[PDB]
Write a structure and sequence with these properties.
The structure is cut from a larger assembly and holds chains A (141 residues), B (61 residues), C (48 residues), D (184 residues) and E (261 residues). Chain A has 141 residues and is α+β, with helices and mostly antiparallel strands. Helices cover 17% and strands 29% of the residues of chain A. In chain A, a hairpin with a 5-residue loop joins strand 2 and strand 3. The longest helix of chain A has 12 residues. With 61 residues, chain B is mainly alpha-helical. Chain C is mainly α and 48 residues long. Chain C is built from two helices and no strands. Chain C starts with 7 loop residues before the first helix and ends in an 8-residue tail after the last helix. The chains are: A alpha+beta (141), B mainly alpha (61), C mainly alpha (48), D mainly alpha (184), E mainly beta (261). Chains A and C meet through strand 1 of A and helix 1 of C. Bound molecules: potassium ion (8 copies) and magnesium ion (28 copies). Chain A binds one RNA strand of 307 nucleotides through helix 1, helix 2, strand 1, strand 2 and strand 4. Chain B: It comes from Solanum lycopersicum. Chain B: Belongs to the eukaryotic ribosomal protein eS24 family.
Chain lengths: 141, 61, 48, 184, 261
RNA sequence: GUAGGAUAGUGGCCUACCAUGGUGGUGACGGGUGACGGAGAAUUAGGGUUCGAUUCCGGAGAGGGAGCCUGAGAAACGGCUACCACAUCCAAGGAAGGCAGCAGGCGCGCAAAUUACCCAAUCCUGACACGGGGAGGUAGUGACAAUAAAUAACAAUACCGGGAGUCUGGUAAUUGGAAUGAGUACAAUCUAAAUCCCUUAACGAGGAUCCAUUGGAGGGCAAGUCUGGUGCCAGCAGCCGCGGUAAUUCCAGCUCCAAUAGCGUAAUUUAAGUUGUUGCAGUUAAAAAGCUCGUAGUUGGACUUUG
């Protein structure tokens, strides 16, 4: 059982120190591997759209999830960013600056989209929500 | 509305007021004039004037 | 997969303009009617 | 360094932990409509203030009744409640502080007292009168409905001298109408 | 830092000055002088914040530059001059004369004095030792040095100094049974009778002081200042007379005052 | 350790000589830190967890090192000298450079404002009551954050309920007269001078267009088995799931719900007694070392002066 001695302060403190690593949440933050992620600990990130792609929805669903491969400007890493809402892929062109954000599960895949953990927030400095609701238009043409 | 509060000073004579009263409060009562000046211009003149030696400091435009 | 069908349904949906109506009260007044309609006088949006 | 950085400020309310509890929504809306509150924020800050008062009383009650801090701060807390009418002279004990409710604080609002003193036809009518500069507490005009009236000041609530309802000239609506009638 | 600091941030000033925190970013930096910067009251505070004669920092300079203020019988023109405990401040134009004494709450109080009583002050002896040529001398805690002192005077004693003749008129030996005032720490401003002296070799000496109402409090020897021999102080004390009342007692007086006043 | 040297002074601080010591599982030494330390900050039944670049205190640096003069005080950088790294001017022989001060620009980025006014307040400094102060203050930008608080009130009709009847209560872009600040503006006040606020002549509300928004309406979880479109497509969906021709879940209209001048989305606390000292588990769910010995560690019977 637990060590109870009044003089066992060191052992209890050292025991807990070793055992905290067994916790996945603790080890994820204190490992230092977060800085190796594409965002490198950032909430958002800008990137350049390399190409427009579709990803087959995971079973038992059946659909083509519209995504876009994006290369991050600050570190040059390539990621897949999901484009939400209906018909918003038409607002995205290749070699365009897009602001990327997490998908809501802190680096984990969301929904039936396989291996996707990012979504597109802005395109050409304009939020997709504004374009979807016809609030604004992209600055070109 | 209906009430105001302020601070007042009564001096024994105008001569005493001009000695202890700040300049800006004397201009309000009309006991002194206002000399218009630009602090930034004065600073630039100071820096230009210290690159010359002798009586030519003043003549430095 | 094919990307040519993006925006399919949204473009097919016929446009229907919103009907302009008198605005509801704001702030305290809004809570006044909300209070009379639930305590002074089936769910709130039942299809009765 | 900026001197303004040393100015203090704090929060006055906390949002509910459970946002969609049907029982809580029903109870809160009843108080909001009864006292003509603007929104749930006004009710929540009163609850926040009430929690602070009760928390102070609990700490004092946990101490020995002979503790000097218990005696000193306990009397001050009771005196503060009495001065606002929350408690009565017959309830001079910290235990009665723990029995206070939100309704007690809402009844001391200027909006509630204006309506319950006959100056206003409805609780909502009192709200408009206060914000429209028609009420005064003593000599000072008060345009805040949340003003918590004191017992010594409850009897001095009256219409402002500048208001049309307190001896002042009629408002611009009547004056313009009188002008229009004269032109005829 | 590479030398001496010339500024005092307002929040870093001594609390007993009672300076509003939003009044500015700076507080008057006490000048070097007889008293320590943390145990003094600069003339700017006295003239502007305590007596209200000056309304601004500038007006204090005008008053002092006219030679209208004297400290310990000498005119002082330094705005941040460190006036401290037992110092006598005289303003001939207003015919006023004050002595800096701590109130029972530990803050300097400008105790108005009569003309006769403003001709002397009390000083605490720091040490007595031989100077150059074997001439004995003593120095006090207010920066004063007196040569050829009475041989009976020893460290920690109190001497009555005449501001006119600048000579020691009388002195009080530091011993149990005399009335003393606390000049520092938690018990600052309290007056009582020295009841005991506990010495600890190599450490600070503790002194037990009993108030006139029987309340007993301790403190360090460095915070004690003898005021008189026996039980009667040689200087006039404020209304409190060094009697520290409990918050309950103080609240009781306030409640009674409202009923009467 | 001894004797010197040097220093404002103690000291292997340094030199000569001599001795062989010094630290370490009570973690030395080394490594990592997206590490300046503290006062403190967030959240906290209690214990606790996390944070602390930043206005107070202490330290450190002035592109990277090193050296130094002056001086009471500097190994100073809005002082000098050299090297290195960048970079300005030149009549090409030279010369002058240090914004992690204020403002501003470029770059970097998810990420941050005026190349403004003033020494009037706070205080500092000089030979000095007077000069100076991008310290500091004032205004501009400012939905970081925080506080108060509008967007209607009342009456009469019509309509609809409750306690044939009559008192009360609820609806309507109906009909009426009242109230009022947003705004605007004489003025005064405010201020160093302006500006805002406060005060106030006049003016200023009926669809009082002087138009409240942001997210939702299968469950978790407050709110529709409404109508049109789409037909495993398009999309939704934090999780469970919805969509394959009669979709409560997608795209729309209507209605309704929550918060409300705010609200949605993308490290950390709470929930977590899922890190358990308080306070968790280890027969079968993840978990007793194959067995015993054994040092450090941790833990160790009773008894001595009561009445
Ligand atoms: K633990
Ligand atoms: K130093
Ligand atoms: K030395
Ligand atoms: K040695
Ligand atoms: K010097
Ligand atoms: K100044
Ligand atoms: K000066
Ligand atoms: K427990
Ligand atoms: Mg056991
Ligand atoms: Mg410095
Ligand atoms: Mg000693
Ligand atoms: Mg030596
Ligand atoms: Mg050697
Ligand atoms: Mg740290
Ligand atoms: Mg670092
Ligand atoms: Mg810090
Ligand atoms: Mg850093
Ligand atoms: Mg900064
Ligand atoms: Mg600092
Ligand atoms: Mg330095
Ligand atoms: Mg740099
Ligand atoms: Mg240097
Ligand atoms: Mg510089
Ligand atoms: Mg410097
Ligand atoms: Mg920002
Ligand atoms: Mg509006
Ligand atoms: Mg206004
Ligand atoms: Mg819908
Ligand atoms: Mg529900
Ligand atoms: Mg349908
Ligand atoms: Mg749903
Ligand atoms: Mg867990
Ligand atoms: Mg478990
Ligand atoms: Mg098994
Ligand atoms: Mg098992
Ligand atoms: Mg035993």
């Amino acid at each position: 059982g637990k060590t109870r001695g009044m003089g066992a302060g060191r052992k209890l403190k050292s025991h807990r120190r070793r055992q905290r690593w067994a916790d996945k949440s603790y080890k994820k933050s204190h490992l230092g591997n977060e800085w190796k992620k594409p965002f490198a600990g950032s909430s958002h990130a800008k990137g350049i759209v390399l190409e427009k792609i579709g990803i087959e929805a995971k079973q038992p669903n059946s659909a083509i999830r519209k995504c876009a491969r994006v290369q991050l400007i600050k570190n040059g890493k390539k990621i897949a960013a999901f484009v939400p809402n209906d018909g918003c892929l038409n607002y995205i062109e290749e070699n365009d600056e897009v602001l990327i954000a997490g998908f809501g599960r802190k680096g984990h895949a969301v929904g039936d989209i396989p291996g996707v953990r990012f979504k597109v927030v802005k395109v050409s400095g304009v939020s997709l929500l504004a374009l979807f609701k016809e609030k604004k238009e992209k600055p070109r043409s | 509305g209906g009430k105001s509060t302020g601070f007042g000073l009564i001096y024994d004579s105008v001569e005493n007021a001009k000695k202890y009263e700040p300049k800006y409060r004397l201009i309000r009562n009309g006991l002194d004039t206002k000399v218009e000046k630009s602090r930034k211009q004065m600073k630039e003149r100071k820096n230009r004037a210290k690159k010359v030696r002798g009586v030519k400091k003043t003549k430095a435009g | 997969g094919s990307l040519a069908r993006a925006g399919k349904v949204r473009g097919q949906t016929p446009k229907v303009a919103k009907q302009d109506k008198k605005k509801k009260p704001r702030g305290r007044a809004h809570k006044r009617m909300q209070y009379n309609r639930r305590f002074v006088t089936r769910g709130p949006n039942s299809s009765e | 360094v900026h001197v303004s950085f040393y100015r203090n400020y704090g929060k006055t309310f906390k949002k509910p932990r459970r946002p969609y509890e049907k029982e809580r929504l029903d109870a809160e809306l009843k108080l909001v409509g009864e006292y003509g509150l603007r929104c749930k924020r006004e009710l929540w800050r009163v609850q926040y203030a009430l929690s602070r008062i009760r928390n102070a009383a609990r700490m004092l009650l946990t101490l020995d009744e002979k503790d000097p801090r218990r005696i000193f701060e306990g009397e001050a807390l009771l005196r503060r409640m009495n001065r606002y009418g929350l408690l009565d002279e017959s309830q001079n004990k910290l235990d009665y502080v723990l029995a206070l409710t939100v309704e007690n604080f809402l009844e001391r609002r200027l909006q509630t007292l204006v309506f319950k003193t006959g100056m206003a036809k409805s609780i909502h009518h009192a709200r408009v009168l206060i914000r429209q500069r028609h009420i005064r507490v003593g000599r000072q005009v008060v345009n805040v409905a949340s003003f918590m009236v004191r017992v010594d000041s409850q009897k001095h609530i009256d219409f402002s001298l500048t208001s049309p309802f307190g001896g002042g000239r009629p408002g611009r609506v009547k004056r313009k109408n009188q002008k229009s009638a004269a032109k005829k | 830092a590479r030398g001496l600091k010339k500024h005092l941030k307002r929040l870093n000033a001594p609390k007993h000055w009672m300076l509003d925190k939003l009044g500015g970013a700076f507080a008057p930096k006490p000048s070097s002088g007889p008293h320590k910067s943390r145990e003094c009251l600069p003339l700017v505070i006295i003239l502007r914040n305590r007596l209200k004669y000056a309304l601004t920092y500038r007006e204090v300079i005008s008053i002092l530059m006219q030679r209208q203020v004297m400290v310990d019988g000498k005119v002082r023109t330094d705005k941040t001059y460190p006036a401290g405990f037992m110092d006598v401040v005289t303003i001939p134009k207003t015919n006023e004369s004050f002595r800096l004494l701590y109130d029972t709450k530990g803050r300097f109080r400008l105790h108005s004095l009569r003309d006769e009583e403003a001709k002397f002050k009390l000083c605490k002896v720091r040490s007595v030792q031989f100077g150059q040529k074997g001439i004995p001398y003593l120095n006090t805690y207010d920066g004063r040095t007196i040569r050829y002192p009475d041989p009976l005077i020893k460290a920690n004693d109190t001497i009555k100094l005449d501001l006119d003749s600048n000579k020691i008129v009388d002195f009080i030996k530091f011993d149990v049974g005399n009335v003393v005032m606390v000049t520092g720490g938690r018990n600052r401003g309290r007056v009582g009778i020295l009841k005991n002296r506990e010495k600890h070799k190599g450490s600070f000496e503790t002194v037990h002081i009993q108030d006139s109402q029987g309340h007993e409090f301790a403190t360090r020897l460095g915070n004690v200042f003898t005021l008189g021999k026996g039980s009667k102080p040689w200087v006039s004390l404020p209304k409190g007379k060094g009697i520290k009342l409990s918050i309950i007692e103080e609240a009781r007086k306030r409640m009674a005052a409202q009923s009467a006043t």
